[PDB]
Amino acid sequence: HMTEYKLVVVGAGCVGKSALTIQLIQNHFVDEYDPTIEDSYRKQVVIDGETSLLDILDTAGQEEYSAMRDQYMRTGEGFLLVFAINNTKSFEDIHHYREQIKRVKDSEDVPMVLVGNKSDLPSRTVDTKQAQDLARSYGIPFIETSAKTRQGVDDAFYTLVREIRKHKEK
Q: Does 140 bind ligand VJB (CB under 6 A)?
A: no
Q: Does 148 bind ligand VJB (CB under 6 A)?
A: yes
Q: Closest separation between CB of residue 79 and ligand VJB, Å?
A: 14
Q: How many CA atoms lie within 13 A of 71 on its CB side?
A: 7
Contacting residue, 17, 43, 69, 98, with ligand VJB by CB under 6 A = 17
Q: Does 13 bind ligand VJB (CB under 6 A)?
A: yes
Contacting residue, 1, 2, 32, 122, with ligand VJB by CB under 6 A = 32
DSSP string across the chain? --EEEEEEEEESTTSSHHHHHHHHHHS---SS--GGGGG--EEEEEETTEEEEEEEEE-TT--TT-HHHHHHHHH-SEEEEEEETT-HHHHHTHHHHHHHHHHHHT-S---EEEEEE-TTSSS-SS-HHHHHHHHHHHT--EEE--TTT-TTHHHHHHHHHHHHHHHHT-
Q: Closest separation between CB of residue 82 and ligand VJB, Å?
A: 7
From residue 76 to residue 95, the character string flagging contacts with ligand VJB as x (rule: CB under 6 A) and all else as - is --------------------
Q: Does 31 bind ligand VJB (CB under 6 A)?
A: yes
Choice between 3 and 100, CB closer to ligand VJB:
100
Q: Torsions phi, psi of 125, nearest 5?
A: -120, -5
Q: Closest separation between CB of residue 74 and ligand VJB, Å?
A: 21
Q: Does 121 bind ligand VJB (CB under 6 A)?
A: yes
Contacts with ligand VJB, residue ranges (CB under 6 A): 11, 13-19, 31-33, 60, 117-118, 120-121, 146-148
